Structure formats: C-alpha cells, structure tokens
RNA sequence: CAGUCAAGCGUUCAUAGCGACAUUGCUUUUUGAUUCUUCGAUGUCGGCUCUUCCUAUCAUACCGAAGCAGAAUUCGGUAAGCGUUGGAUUGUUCACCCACUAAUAGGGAACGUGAGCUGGGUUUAGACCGUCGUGAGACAGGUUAGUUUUACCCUACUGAUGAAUGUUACCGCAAUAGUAAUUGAACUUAGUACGAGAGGAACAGUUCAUUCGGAUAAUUGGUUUUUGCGGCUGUCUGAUCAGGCAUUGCCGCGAAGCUACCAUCCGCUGGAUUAUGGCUGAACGCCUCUAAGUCAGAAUCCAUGCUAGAACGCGGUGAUUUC
RNA sequence: CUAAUUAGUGACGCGCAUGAAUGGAUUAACGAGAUUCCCACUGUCCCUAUCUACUAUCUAGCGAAACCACAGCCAAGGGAA
RNA sequence: GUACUGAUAACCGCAGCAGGUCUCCAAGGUGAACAGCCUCUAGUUGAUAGAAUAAUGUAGAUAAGGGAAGUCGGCAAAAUA
C-alpha cells in the first residue's frame, strides 16, 4: 500500500484512485484525477498553474 | 493466447476490434498491423472480435516491406492505449496500440521491441519478455 | 422461415417478473436450514445501506498471479444498529404449508415500534398495545399460556424484531418490523430465548463474524417506466428507422396472433425484490469504537465515515457490516443480511481476510485527503484558520 | 430423409464401415400437379430486429460399437437443456472464399416478421444500349432515376391503480405460474499410461477466461442547464465594477445524478430417471440386466433456491369512534 | 487491387447480338449524373450511454375524424381446405 | 378617382391557412459584404394556458478505445473552411 504523488500537481494518489499513463519513451505519469490528466494532455505547464505544488514551490508560497 | 502462452491472462478491457490498425514494435520490417481476428475470441451476433494487450491476433501488414505484405500472420499486442484496470487498482494506458509479429507457437519474428511493453504481455509470452526493454 | 442467425435472448425469464415490489422491505423466502445441535442464533439481520468505499487487502490464493499481493476491492457499508426483539411467533406444519398460530409480544414497545402500526401517528390517541399490556398486568398468566401453546405446537419459531432507526441518521422515525427465524436448540429453547430477549437488543456481532459469506435481500433502486432498450437490453434499431429506434422490431409471428409473454416489452425498471448470495463479510465494526476505519497496518485513528459523511446518507455512528462488492438497493434502504443457506466451501470462501487500508476520502468528488488532519498537514494554514 | 434382402467391397471376412439388382416407407424446408378460398385488394423479394417451437443432433453431458494400442476418427443410443460467429463480393435467398471457434446443424411459425424498419431487387409513368418489328412497340435481356399512408378502438402483451366479503393497521403462509446458467484455455497429473518408434491421453486438483443474467456506482471513463467557476469574440449598458443578447454564443475544468464487459460484484445442491452397464433370478433343471424384484447413472425431470403472490386462496396480531 | 472481391480497373476477343452523322474511336474543362478505391474524419458500427427544448402525461377551457352486422380469451376439430 | 389594408388577420387559397402575391425608402458597430451577430428610430410583445419532467418521438448536442468492421451504397453526421 503505497501513496504515490501526482506527476502534474504533486497531490497524493491513494491506492485505486486516478489514472496512470505510460509515454512512448516509457516514462510513467500518475494522475490523481481527470483534471490534472486533462491539463497534461493540453500540454500545460505545471509551474504556471497556480494551485500545483510546483507553482507553490517556485513562487515560494 | 492459447498455444504457446503459458499462464493465464486476467481480463483487461478490449480496445482493438476487427479492422483496427496498430503500430508495429519489432524490427521485422512492418510499419503497422491490421488486426483481422483475435485468438480465443467468443461468439455473439454483431459483436466485433476485439483485441487487448497480451493476445495473439491474426493480422496483415498493410505498410512495410513487401516480403511481409498481403499475407496473414499471428501478431501479439504489446501496447494497448485503451485504459484497463489491473487488480491492484490502478488504471493505465499507453500512447499507442502496438504489436509484434510472431509464429503461432509464440516466437517473435523480429529481435527487439521499441517502446515499453505491458507486463501482462511479458509474463504471458516469454519471447516477448526476452526481446523487450522496459516492461511498463 | 427460421431465425437465420442465433443469439441468446435478451433477459431472464425467471425474473421476467419486473413489477414494483410490495414494499421497501424485501421478504426472506427461505431462512437457513435448522441444525438443532447448535445454540440459539438469529438467521438474518436488518441494516441500512450507507454507501460504498474501497479497501486494500492482501490476497491469499496460491496459484494466482496476484497471490500475496495487494488488491483493491469495492465494498458496501451497511449501518446496523442493534436490532431489538419485541415478539415471538409460532408456526405449525400443515398439509397446506406453514401456518402461524400464535404471536406473543412484549410488555413495553417503543414509539419506533408503535409508529409502524400507524399511518397518521401525530393525530392518534396512540392506543396501540394498550389493552395487550393488561395481559402482563395480572401476574403474567395468559402470556405464559400462549407461550406454552407455542411450546406444544409450532414446529418453527420466528422472532419479531425491529430496527432502532433513531440511531440512524435518516429522517424516517417509523421503524421497520420483521420476522427472523431462530435456529439452534429445541422449540422449547427457541421460545425460551425469545421470551428472555423481550425488549432487549441483539447486536450484529452476535449474528455474524469475520469472513462469513452472507446473502443480501433488498429492493433494487427504482427508475420508473423504462423503454425496452434499457429494461431488456435489446439491440437498438438503425438510424433510418421510422417511428422510433429504441424499440423491439418484431413483436411476434402471425401465427399465433397473440403477443407472447416472453417477448421484450416496455414497462417498469427497478424497485424489484432481489436476493444476492455469497457476499463475504470483510469487517464487523463497532459503534462504541473510534478508529473504525483503522487497520493493524494503517494505525491512523479514523472512523469509516468519509470526509463530509457518506453522500446522500449521513454519518455512521453505530455498528456496521462492511461486505465485499455490490449489494442491491441504493443508499438509505432497508436491507436484510441473511446467513448462507448452503456451506460455501469453494475456496473463494474460507479465505481469512485481513484488510490493509480503508478509504475514507470524500465521495462527494475527487476526494484526496483521508483525514482533516492530513488535509491540514498538506495545505498548511489558511485564511479561515487560527 | 429412413428402411428391408444380400451379389459383392473390406488381404481373410456379407452386415466394423459400406453395399449393387430389387423392394417398403416417411416428410412437406424442393419443384411440379390441381384450381378449393381470396380480383367492392389478406401489402411483393431479400436483409435488419425479436420471440417461440421441431429434431432428421454440429457442438456440449453420459454411453454402446469399431478394421477402438495411444492420439485422431468413424458408426450409433438417450437427449432440443444449452449455444451455433466476425467479414470481402453479390439486391440476393443460394453461393463462394477469408479467419476465429467448443461448434460455426438443418428447419417451421400466412415461404414468421413493411399501421416494425429499409427499399438494393422485381413490377407503372422518364431514359440509354443490344436483338426483334415497316411501324406503333416487345424482350421470362443489360443499365440508370423513381412519394412506403393511419392506431386514439377491441383483444393480446408489458407495466399501473382499483369497488366489494365489519373498519383499519402490521406480520405472514404458499396454490399456481415462470426460472438459468454456460462453454473453453493454461498449469499439474505427464512426456505418464499406451506404443517398436513416431507420437501421446484421461479422471482428480488449481488459476483464469467465453457467452448469458441479476444488480451496482467506491474507483476509472462518458454525459453537463450545477449555465458551478474561470477564459474568449462581436455588440449594448458613457467609463469602471457588474451584467444583457448571440434560440444553451463558444472554450477548459467540472461535483451530483444517470450510466459502460468502457467499470465492479455476484450467479445453489438434493432426490427420481433416459440411454447404458450391472446384481439376484426364473421362463427354458443350463444360461441370461427382466419376466417378479433390483444397483448405479445424462447438460434430462422434480425439488432446494430465486421472482410474483390467487386483485372471489388462507392464517396470526393490534386498535376498534359516543352528542 | 483485398486476409478474402458475382464489385473496380488493365488486357484478351469466332463479338448469342460492337461498329462508323442509327454516327465510330478519343477527349481538356464542366456535372446536386452512375460506379470503384485511398487519405482524412466521424456513435454508421462494436455498444450503447447521457443532456436540452417542445410533445406525449396530469389539470382548466375548447373539442373533431377514420371506422363500426353484432361484437370481442384461447387450443384443437370440422368447415368455402 | 382620392378613406384604409397591401398581408403569419383587410387579396387568392372552403378559414383570422407556416402557402402564394409587383415595387420605392433604407441608421451604427464587427466584418470584403444589402452575409451572420448585436443595437438606434419606428413597430410589436401576437401564436390556449397551469403543473410535473415516465417511456417512445421531433428538433439540438456530446462521447472513452477502434475507425465504415454498419449498410445496396460512408445514407446521416463529423472533419475542412
């Protein structure tokens, strides 16, 4: 029973929750919901989405 | 599945009906794979025999070297890109439907596999597992 | 001419029946078989479906690929406050079937029970069982007389229980009354157990246990008048069809000139009585116990009620049964949990389960935090806080 | 389609499987024959859809024979419980090939099924070609374009109420009616039995899967008038904030609800039998599964179980009105 | 050409019964003409699901027609089959 | 002769019928535009209503993975712009 973290937003991914996504170069993306999954497939930047962990790390929140 | 696939396959979501064209993954010379039937598939009125990761499918090569073309050969699906559920609760999906061509016994005609391979394919066909690089 | 193409039929003709049920409380047509070498025990129990959540546990199934490996499994939680015995009932064997000859009640019935025998409870003088308690007035003579009348006759003995619905967060003050057949011991010892439990409660941990396989009897969630494509699962007619496509095209042959009963025809969907057998009990939880959702592996103090409560139900504060898989009926519904009638030994049973984690994130959305302490530990201090 | 007889085939050997010359039947899914019904009209072919029935059984269950060593196969018995597919070409029924499959059996129901659809075909009117005709025109020749109407009535069916048998409420019984599960793969048995070798099983056990069914919505996915939040265009409110209209303006996310083998869960075990193999045992001093008796046995039947509860089937229990 | 093509195209031609202003053969451009294939695209399909408006539904008012021997539960029998 | 309508109510369609019926004038923005979309003057706010939100319709949509396997035929929709 491992709690995984969101690749996009840094949220916690509890067991049996959200989707996983294996890219063509075998890089594993685990998403907590369809919201952060859809923002990834829109090629959005996590550092420019205000509620992500990477925003609050870069903006020193 | 069936012959040459030692072990069982848990039911994952069928994502590739008859008439699907999936990418090729091995260095056999093919560029795509046109699925025409699934081994071990069942019968229902108007139900398309649909394929998933790990199954041996009957498939022709539409695009590739002409020494592979216009004939029907067994192929093994190594990537699905339809989201299926494993029993540990996670849903996952690749970037593309992709397969490797083989004999009916289960030996790969090619020698390498580019891209990742699902583990339900690797554990079921050991010659896929030996030729694969990253598994999932 | 013939069909030209065989297909299995759409629907099941043994549930061909599709009408609305007689009540929200579905009847138990068969209690488990009686083995009189055992102690006295109830054969079923009444509960309320709260909703579903997710469990992580280890598998013990040697020969499988997920053996000794964590799997996640959907479960149902039913809130079971301790049922309380108000009556006993005797049934004698006839050549025409079981016949109730006598029904004895207790001296004091609560307003939950009395409220069941009333359609307008607030307007009433509240006269129910007022003259009946006079039988307990003179020294208990006639009560023991009808008890001995049960003891002489009455090949099978059932017990009238009722739910404590005031401990259950619904707005429904009127409780449900039911007959649960006792099993073990003699007919004498059956009605002795029944007399000694008048006005006293029976908890669910005396009726079930860990790793038991139980049947769930309930009423399917109703949907109203429904067309044939969803009520029966018929292939949709193509795009070019005049007068509708969510239909059945041929209704029958010309000979005979009647519509047959077995054709798929529109009507009511849902609100059917259904019994589903072989559901494994994953947890018997206690209301007098915080950390209900905790685990030997987890060890966080948390109850099974998720963040913001069970949606459309409320907040579980009583004993509960957490049972693997899907149960008929929606949330809030009265559900009868029966012991299995046959000894299921097919190795999916007899597996001693032991959970690893219980999901208590909010089912009101993409719930991501199991506890409010964890939510605060992630997010830090906010504008509302301190 | 099924028999009867047996000259021969089957190295030997009529009847394991076949079987000529003859001969006896059955069926009405063929085509004829007839013209009884309908010309003050029973809507044509084929396909789709959907239900049920037949058995002359393709598969599955249990068996019996073999020219049955194993494997594979062939012949037959009970059996219609259960399934019997996806496609290329053709309007096709029919056909033919491709592949999967456990198997891709044959049929009926006004050649089932057009107030169910479709209208590719045939079979009005337009038109072209070929052949025929002096011609108008013909073709059981080819081609192309060609309006598919009505249920609100009775019955049937599916659901839904409901008067009356003191009133009203609660808990029940169960007559009857229906019914459901299905089929395969892998591992092990086991490179074992068997076999000169080549090859090569089965019962039991385990793990899964196919087809179906009943639910369900924790998760994943879909749906968005939560017009919930944000963004954007054009315009109007003098600006700003906040909005209106663009028939839901559009875009991203989106709870809840509904829902998907696109998601998850679940789908019972007892008896009586058929075919068959037997026991004792006469008729027929022997022998025999049969005559009396009887043992075991099929996916069969009946019950357990599941669904509904006779609105004219029944029980128990509570309260039973005063101006 | 396709895994498979009674379709399509290219050839072949003792052509039932092609053929020269009954005009023959060919033709760029044009066509709501007929047909075949490919890319794209999609709920046409696998396999269905969900949402919106107006109906249908219930109510107040208004209020027809088709059709109608009598009417309306079957199984079989016979009977203008 | 001179009023008035000139039509979703003054005309013709059995009628106060979504049909038909000749013409003049012709604002601002966006925009190539007498297109669509919004506004000013002028003119309407007429069309049986109320309540619920079953099935099946009619009109409008959206769909995971596959992409014509559906079908006589890519019909209808999508895609493109």
From Swiss-Prot, chain A:
Protein name, entry field: Large ribosomal subunit protein eL24A
Other notes: Present with 247000 molecules/cell in log phase SD medium. There are 2 genes for eL24 in yeast.
Organism phylogeny: Eukaryota, Fungi, Dikarya, Ascomycota, Saccharomycotina
Known function: Component of the ribosome, a large ribonucleoprotein complex responsible for the synthesis of proteins in the cell. The small ribosomal subunit (SSU) binds messenger RNAs (mRNAs) and translates the encoded message by selecting cognate aminoacyl-transfer RNA (tRNA) molecules. The large subunit (LSU) contains the ribosomal catalytic site termed the peptidyl transferase center (PTC), which catalyzes the formation of peptide bonds, thereby polymerizing the amino acids delivered by tRNAs into a polypeptide chain.
Modification Phosphoserine, positions: 7
Annotated organism of origin: Saccharomyces cerevisiae (strain ATCC 204508 / S288c) (Baker's yeast)
Cellular localisation: Cytoplasm
Recorded family membership: Belongs to the eukaryotic ribosomal protein eL24 family.
Subunit comment: Component of the large ribosomal subunit (LSU). Mature yeast ribosomes consist of a small (40S) and a large (60S) subunit. The 40S small subunit contains 1 molecule of ribosomal RNA (18S rRNA) and 33 different proteins (encoded by 57 genes). The large 60S subunit contains 3 rRNA molecules (25S, 5.8S and 5S rRNA) and 46 different proteins (encoded by 81 genes).
Curated annotation (Swiss-Prot), chain B:
Localization per record: Cytoplasm
Residues bearing the modification N-acetylserine: 1
PROSITE patterns xref list: RIBOSOMAL_L14 (PS00049)
Keywords of this entry: Acetylation, Cytoplasm, Methylation, Ribonucleoprotein, Ribosomal protein
PTM section of the record: Methylated by RKM1 at 2 different sites, but it is unclear which are the 2 methylated residues among Lys-39, Lys-105 and/or Lys-109.
Residues with N6,N6-dimethyllysine modification: 105, 109
Pfam families recorded: Ribosomal_L14 (PF00238)
GO biological process: cytoplasmic translation
GO CC annotations, alphabetized: cytosol; cytosolic large ribosomal subunit
An example Gene Ontology molecular-function term: large ribosomal subunit rRNA binding
HAMAP family in alphabetical order: Ribosomal_uL14 (MF_01367)
Assembly and binders: Component of the large ribosomal subunit (LSU). Mature yeast ribosomes consist of a small (40S) and a large (60S) subunit. The 40S small subunit contains 1 molecule of ribosomal RNA (18S rRNA) and 33 different proteins (encoded by 57 genes). The large 60S subunit contains 3 rRNA molecules (25S, 5.8S and 5S rRNA) and 46 different proteins (encoded by 81 genes).
Functional description taken from the UniProt entry: Component of the ribosome, a large ribonucleoprotein complex responsible for the synthesis of proteins in the cell. The small ribosomal subunit (SSU) binds messenger RNAs (mRNAs) and translates the encoded message by selecting cognate aminoacyl-transfer RNA (tRNA) molecules. The large subunit (LSU) contains the ribosomal catalytic site termed the peptidyl transferase center (PTC), which catalyzes the formation of peptide bonds, thereby polymerizing the amino acids delivered by tRNAs into a polypeptide chain.
Family statement: Belongs to the universal ribosomal protein uL14 family.
Additional facts recorded: There are 2 genes for uL14 in yeast.
Name recorded for this polypeptide: Large ribosomal subunit protein uL14A
Provenance organism: Saccharomyces cerevisiae (strain ATCC 204508 / S288c)
Swiss-Prot record, chain C:
Modification Phosphothreonine occurs at: 102
Location(s), subcellular: Cytoplasm
The record's account of how the chain is modified after translation: Methylation at His-242 by HPM1 is required for proper 60S subunit assembly and promotes translational elongation fidelity.
Any single GO BP term: cytoplasmic translation
A GO cellular-component term linked to this record: cytoplasm
Chief localisation class: cytoplasm
Effect on the protein upon substituting residue 242 to A: Cells accumulate 35S and 23S pre-rRNA precursors. Cells display defects in translation elongation resulting in decreased translational accuracy
Superkingdom of the source species: Eukaryota
Assembly information from the UniProt record: Component of the large ribosomal subunit (LSU). Mature yeast ribosomes consist of a small (40S) and a large (60S) subunit. The 40S small subunit contains 1 molecule of ribosomal RNA (18S rRNA) and 33 different proteins (encoded by 57 genes). The large 60S subunit contains 3 rRNA molecules (25S, 5.8S and 5S rRNA) and 46 different proteins (encoded by 81 genes). uL3 forms together with ES39L one of the contact sites for the signal recognition particle that targets ribosomes to the endoplasmic reticulum membrane.
Family indicated by similarity: Belongs to the universal ribosomal protein uL3 family.
Note: Present with 450 molecules/cell in log phase SD medium.
Protein name: Large ribosomal subunit protein uL3
Source species of the chain: Saccharomyces cerevisiae (strain ATCC 204508 / S288c)
Organism classification: Eukaryota, Fungi, Dikarya, Ascomycota, Saccharomycotina
